[PDB]
Amino acid sequence: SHMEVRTIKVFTTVDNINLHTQVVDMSMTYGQQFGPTYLDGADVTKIKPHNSHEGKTFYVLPNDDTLRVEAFEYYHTTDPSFLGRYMSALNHTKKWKYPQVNGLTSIKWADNNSYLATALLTLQQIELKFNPPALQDAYYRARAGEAANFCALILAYCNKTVGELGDVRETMSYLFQHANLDSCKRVLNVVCKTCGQQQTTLKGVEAVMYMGTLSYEQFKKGVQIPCTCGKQATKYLVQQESPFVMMSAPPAQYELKHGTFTCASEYTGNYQCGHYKHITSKETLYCIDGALLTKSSEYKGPITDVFYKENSYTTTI
Ligand SMILES: [Cl-]
Ligand code: NA
Ligand code: NA
Ligand SMILES: [Zn+2]
């Protein structure tokens, strides 16, 4: 026997701004009508419409020409599963806590998220503007204290699920790919006693990141690196134009001196079985570990990333 058809009006979206009116049959699941569907992060694909859902907004995958354009303009991605990864992470990050620690939005530990807490604290201390409007909107909310959307977007952009381990340097590199760093320029010189000098110019993300030493002062004086001839070449910073620099190295015992750096990330333990902490240099040295806070006049620990302020630098060598 035919059951009389019942419908409700709902809206679908890929960006929570542009809405698309839909009339849904309450005898069929959201999945049968829209494909994978989410209500504020919760997966409702296998759910049949409820009367209470009338007029609500549901996220869907951008599986039509209009949604494809709206999703590209908002997120700067055409990765087919992006929206699903974003919603899946959001269902968890909306339950995390974001305490204000020393005036910054932190994240209380959950789901192995210490790498995200130190990335978030770091972003609030360096001059950086995101390109996708999704990151601009969510980062503004994160700075105000509501970082759930921003954290779920970091996870989606980095291809990490909630609970999955992450590397801070890798996470910052992904975020920098979605930032406006076109005014950043680095000029390096590599000198070999045999092979001579070779100058290189780096732009954008490559102009603000360096892997090999934590010391910006030592990078300016010269660092010893291998040469193709077998000898050691000296690489030094000739020119730098950027509002910050990020120096990274495999974690090792290192002394952080108050007033000589902006902030840093510490990794205690072996690779894939450790924990990150954040050190910020303000009136004194503050150590932020998610919701936890301690202070000290000096600091020594296994540091893996250090951030420094910059504007314009030219060598004397
Ligand atoms: Cl921004
Ligand atoms: Na997830
Ligand atoms: Na972590
Ligand atoms: Zn050489």
Curated annotation (Swiss-Prot):
Changing residue 69 to A: Partial loss of ISG15 cleavage in vitro. Inhibited in vitro by GRL-0617. It comes from the Viruses. Residues 74-317 form the Peptidase C16 domain. It is a multi-pass membrane protein. It catalyses: Thiol-dependent hydrolysis of ester, thioester, amide, peptide and isopeptide bonds formed by the C-terminal Gly of ubiquitin (a 76-residue protein attached to proteins as an intracellular targeting signal). Residues 5-60 form the Ubiquitin-like domain. It is found in: Host endoplasmic reticulum membrane. Zn(2+) 4 binds at residues 192, 195, 227, 229. The active site is at residues 114, 275, 289. Changing residue 80 to S: In strain: Omicron/BA.2.75. Changing residue 95 to N: In strain: Beta/B.1.351. Changing residue 72 to A: Partial loss of ISG15 cleavage in vitro. May form homohexamers. Interacts with N protein. Responsible for the cleavages located at the N-terminus of the replicase polyprotein. Participates together with nsp4 in the assembly of virally-induced cytoplasmic double-membrane vesicles necessary for viral replication. Antagonizes innate immune induction of type I interferon by blocking the phosphorylation, dimerization and subsequent nuclear translocation of host IRF3. Also prevents host NF-kappa-B signaling. In addition, PL-PRO possesses a deubiquitinating/deISGylating activity and processes both 'Lys-48'- and 'Lys-63'-linked polyubiquitin chains from cellular substrates. This is Papain-like protease nsp3. It comes from Severe acute respiratory syndrome coronavirus 2. The chain holds residues 1564 to 1877 of 4405 of the full protein.
